[PDB]
Symmetry: C2
Subunit: 297 residues, 2 copies
Amino acid sequence: DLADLFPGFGSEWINTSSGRIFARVGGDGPPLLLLHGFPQTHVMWHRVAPKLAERFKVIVADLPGYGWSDMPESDEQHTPYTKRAMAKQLIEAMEQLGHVHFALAGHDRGARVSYRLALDSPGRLSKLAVLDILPTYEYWQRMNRAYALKIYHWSFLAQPAPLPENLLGGDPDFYVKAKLASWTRAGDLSAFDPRAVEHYRIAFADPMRRHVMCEDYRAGAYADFEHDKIDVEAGNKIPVPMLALWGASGIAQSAATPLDVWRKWASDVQGAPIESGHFLPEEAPDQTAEALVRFFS
Amino acid sequence: DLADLFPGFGSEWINTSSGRIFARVGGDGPPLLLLHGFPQTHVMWHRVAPKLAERFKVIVADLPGYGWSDMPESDEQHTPYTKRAMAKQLIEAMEQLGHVHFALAGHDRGARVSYRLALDSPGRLSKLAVLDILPTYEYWQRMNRAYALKIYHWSFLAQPAPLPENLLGGDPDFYVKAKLASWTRAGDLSAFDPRAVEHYRIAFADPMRRHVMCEDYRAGAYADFEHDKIDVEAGNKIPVPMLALWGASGIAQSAATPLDVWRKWASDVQGAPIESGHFLPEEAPDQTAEALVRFFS
């Protein structure tokens, strides 16, 4: 079966109006919500969450539609898998636990939920950390030949259904393992705990979960972009103190200098590179956990 | 099984130093070479070639690596599937037939071979017609969010092997049929002869054929782009009289105004939209054949 990678952490099924959020919960102290991205689940935090649980109440959540969270039915505008909708759902989930003001760190898609949360509902966040992303608007505005080859999956997974679903279903194991490996510094799976890979692979083997991931990327090409575009053309900046962390060999540093971009989006931003590919908490767990503890405390 | 869609045409296997080129040959008069694109074969010309064969010797050729033409071995730079190499191979094939000066019409990938032929060896062409393309450099230069989504397959099929090969293997029948239908005005397969669709489906069923198509798009992302860049920078223009046809709902018209672009690339170019999606000779065979006859006469 699937391994428990958070020894001592509790498990919670949090009801919301859009379905249940699964989370592991551990620690004590100020609340800290950790959000994963694609093609992973909450267990990507398993190397950094124990160190964070020494100082914080750490809630490690599967995104709406991911992992063991429920999958709301999507619609023609991919509404439940827009980051605006996901942020609202997670705000609800945290309200169910009594957390109306919390710290938040996200990676990949979860970092896109995080900064959208901070634009829409800044009063909910004490501090924000985003790992190896630039805003969705910035990726699309920088989509030239070199970047279109590098993050082809942004345009491939956003193709109308069922085109990417039908291609992904012939050999799902190949695709999830290809994405994990190709975005690491070494280019293989050595940075990952093999028990964590099994979580990712099992989640990706469900065709409904794969459809959700495509809906996430469809939202990323359309409504998420439009939502971002409104803010940046209006000069709306994130007022929450924030940390932008990126991998020297990761995705965000390709096609832009991350700190200069985030300073356009956030009034109070600090940044640091980490020698790592895209998967900061697994490739560089110690370095990531130390940056996060220092920033949040 | 596979129908003969060219009543009265002979079937020739033309030997070159890179492998055999398969061609249907009919008519008499000045030689006219017709080149197909992706994901099709020579049979895409089956509704227009008989009307052209009333006034020309019409040679309907499978591109190197496509259809029934031989598949040369590729290499690290995808050399045999660069449009420069494909043009040299087709010049060799025409020489085997005694044709050193000929008319040329190409569609999709075949139109890219054609305009590269016109730039490299303009002395070989009397007149050139390209159907529903802009130069490869122009597509990559106009790469933005909108175009990345519309021609996602330019970045997807160019990913390093075996990523697109594996995914296309997930459902090849769906993918070739999805590509045919989605680029038509109607949005389904009703514009195609079902017997022609069988030709495209059978060719796409061969994994080695699908690999060649990926090598073509890899060339399109790298060497083909660099070859085009040299010409723009040196200001090299096509000196051959050219006709540019495009679909009102086709690919070229979304990127930019196609005649305006081609005038930057050609000193003598006429142009016209056809009421059509991407597949002009099948969606609009009368308008396409009429425009080609008038131009080539």
